[PDB]
Amino acid sequence: GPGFGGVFVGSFKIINYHLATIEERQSAIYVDWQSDVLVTPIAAHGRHQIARCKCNTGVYYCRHRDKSYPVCFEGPGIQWIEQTEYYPARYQTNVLLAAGPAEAGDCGGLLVCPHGVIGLLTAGGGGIVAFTDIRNLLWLDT
């Protein structure tokens, strides 16, 4: 709904690795540190659907500005070394790159297209924003 609390698909929740809790991590069915993503069970009926597409455009929510921004982004791929307070200087996987506002508190924002959710806002700054492509996790739908 609001578009920042991660993706809720079926009885499962998809969120960023650095924003997840230990309890969620201890029950997680899927974990990727490189992609900065977990898929963990939750006792709820998720209303989200993962996008089974190859869209190069989408719309993502910026929390600190409270607005939806459209953007054309680069396909998934390995990304440059960048350091955060949560992670060391490392190359992330399944990264979607675009231009737009992004702040420290905006991590977890949803990028979507007409097919569903494509990724979660991973990091950004200086007018460049990155997302974790979750199109590979569509097996969750079942």
Distance, CA of 26 to CA of 45 (rounded, Å): 21
Q: Is 117 in the site for Zn ion (CB under 5 A)?
A: no
**Residues 6+ positions from 88 with CB-CB distance below 8 Å:** none
Q: Is 63 in the site for Zn ion (CB under 5 A)?
A: no
> Which range in 29-37, 49-57, 68-76, 124-132 contacts Zn ion by CB under 5 A?
49-57
Determine whether 35 is exposed, middle or buried from the number of CB atoms within 10 Å of its CB (0-12, 13-18, 19+).
buried
Nearest distance, CB of residue 55 and Zn ion, angstroms:
3
Cα-based distances in Å from 109 to 6, 27, 66, 117: 7, 23, 11, 10
Single residue of 14, 38, 39, 51 touching Zn ion by CB under 5 A? 51
The reply, when asked if residue 113 is annotated as ligand binding, is yes
Place of tokens 């069970």: 41
The reply, when asked if residue 62 is annotated as ligand binding, is no
Give the binding-site size for Zn ion (rule: CB under 5 A): 5
Task: Outline where DSSP puts E strands in 16-127.
Answer: 30-32, 37-47, 57-62, 67-72, 95-99, 110-113, 116-125
Nearest distance, CB of residue 53 and Zn ion, angstroms:
3
Looking at the Cβ atoms of 42 and 53, the one nearer to Zn ion is: 53
The reply, when asked if residue 107 is annotated as ligand binding, is no
Single residue of 19, 42, 53, 71 touching Zn ion by CB under 5 A? 53
Q: Is 18 in the site for Zn ion (CB under 5 A)?
A: no
